[PDB]
Design a protein around this ligand. Structure first.
Ligand SMILES: CC(=O)N[C@@H](Cc1cc(F)cc(F)c1)[C@H](O)[C@H]1CO[C@@H](OCC2CCCCC2)CN1
Length: 393
């Protein structure tokens, strides 16, 4: 049965890449002010540059919006490395390649920042799609998506198809290239192959999930499953890498090194800091293992697995000489804040944030990078016992 794509107006509305983020075009204010906004499932504030910055070519000008409302309150958001200081307000917001609706939403006008804006990313703001619990200053600041659902007939769901190119893109290349899709209010069936498998959203704060088993080329990492979710496991479009808890990262890297041992790489490569290059077209994908993350299913005692390739966890980067070599960074790194299923993982799949049914769907992406021998996979069911015990308290 042929799968039909019913959300053509929202298909291909994203641009960007895993390293600098995926963004969607939005307008704020009256008359509309066009801004490129980073799509972030790992935070809950909608904020835009609202003052000059060396990395900003445009920003929100509140004095030019007739519909701007001042909330007379400051707001501060600290991320993993970046942070910003802003002024709260509300204004009319639209997504030109989104639903044909305009909503009044909370907007944090960024006045000061540190390592937030990325030089040449082409985005000027952030769209925090997660829940009110993690919004700053507190959970009374209604996130954008909650406003959107409350004010319109848009269903309480969005889905993301993040499309990694498999090769580097310069600033002009990301501007001219399609980066993927953000389908607001539905599931577009042309964006995936095979079946959608659903994992429950453990708690509505981050998009929190439970990992029950981890495999490197079919080999069980054999850790107590609590370790995989210590202190939580989240699906995060706003983080580049697959980030793993310290103990899990150390076990995974030992296994990935063992599986790829026909070639030796410097410590800086495994630390995710140093690039590794191969002659054009000769990347030895086959020496690197596949990685399987088993997720709690919706049916009691049932799990399913998502499998990524090195085409996902090896992030394409440009060489210092901009040569013809194919270069990459190891996009798996240590975390002190739980598992982070970042953009490099999401690039393998069509990810459904079904807020209505408190679940996250995964299916093989129609735009995942692969080779003629292996593809990413979403498979199940597996009989897995005491999966609730994997959750950390
Ligand atoms: C890389 C990165 O920081 N990605 C960010 C988004 C983000 C992207 C970016 F390109 C620059 C930046 F400064 C921030 C993402 O939100 C991460 C942030 O860390 C974790 O969330 C912490 C949470 C605490 C309460 C306030 C909201 C954030 C997990 N999610």
């Amino acid at each position: 049965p042929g799968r039909r794509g019913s959300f053509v107006e929202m298909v291909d509305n994203l641009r960007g890449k895993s390293g600098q983020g995926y963004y969607v075009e939005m307008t704020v204010g009256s008359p509309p002010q066009t801004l490129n906004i980073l799509v972030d499932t790992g935070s809950s504030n909608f904020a835009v540059g609202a003052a000059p910055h060396p990395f900003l070519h445009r920003y929100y000008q509140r004095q030019l919006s007739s519909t701007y409302r001042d909330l007379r309150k400051g707001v501060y958001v600290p991320y993993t490395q970046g942070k910003w200081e802003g002024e709260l307000g509300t204004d009319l917001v639209s997504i030109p390649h989104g639903p044909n609706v305009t909503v009044r939403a909370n907007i944090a006008a960024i006045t000061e920042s540190d390592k937030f804006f990325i030089n040449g990313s082409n985005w000027e703001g952030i769209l925090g799609l997660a829940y009110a619990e993690i919004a700053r200053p507190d959970d009374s600041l209604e996130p954008f998506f909650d406003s959107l659902v409350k004010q319109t007939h848009v269903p309480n769901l969005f889905s993301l198809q993040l499309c990694g190119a498999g090769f580097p893109l310069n600033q002009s290349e990301v501007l001219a290239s399609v980066g993927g899709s953000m389908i607001i209010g539905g599931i577009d069936h042309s964006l995936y192959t095979g079946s959608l498998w659903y994992t429950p959203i453990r708690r509505e704060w981050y998009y929190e999930v439970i990992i029950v088993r981890v495999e490197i080329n079919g080999q069980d990492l054999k850790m107590d499953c609590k370790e995989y979710n210590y202190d939580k496991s989240i699906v995060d479009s706003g983080t580049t890498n697959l980030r793993l808890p310290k103990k899990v990262f150390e076990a995974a890297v030992k296994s990935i090194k063992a599986a790829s041992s026909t070639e030796k790489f410097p410590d800086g490569f495994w630390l995710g800091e140093q690039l590794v290059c191969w002659q054009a077209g000769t990347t030895p994908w086959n020496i690197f293992p596949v990685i399987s993350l088993y997720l709690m299913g919706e049916v009691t005692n049932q799990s399913f697995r998502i499998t990524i390739l090195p085409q996902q966890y090896l992030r394409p980067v440009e060489d210092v000489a901009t040569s013809q070599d194919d270069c990459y960074k190891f996009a798996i790194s240590q975390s002190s804040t739980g598992t982070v299923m970042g953009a490099v993982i999401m690039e393998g799949f069509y990810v459904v944030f079904d807020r209505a049914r408190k679940r996250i769907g995964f299916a093989v992406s129609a735009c995942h990078v692969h080779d003629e021998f292996r593809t990413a996979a979403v498979e199940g069911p597996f009989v897995t016992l005491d999966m609730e015990d994997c959750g950390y308290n």
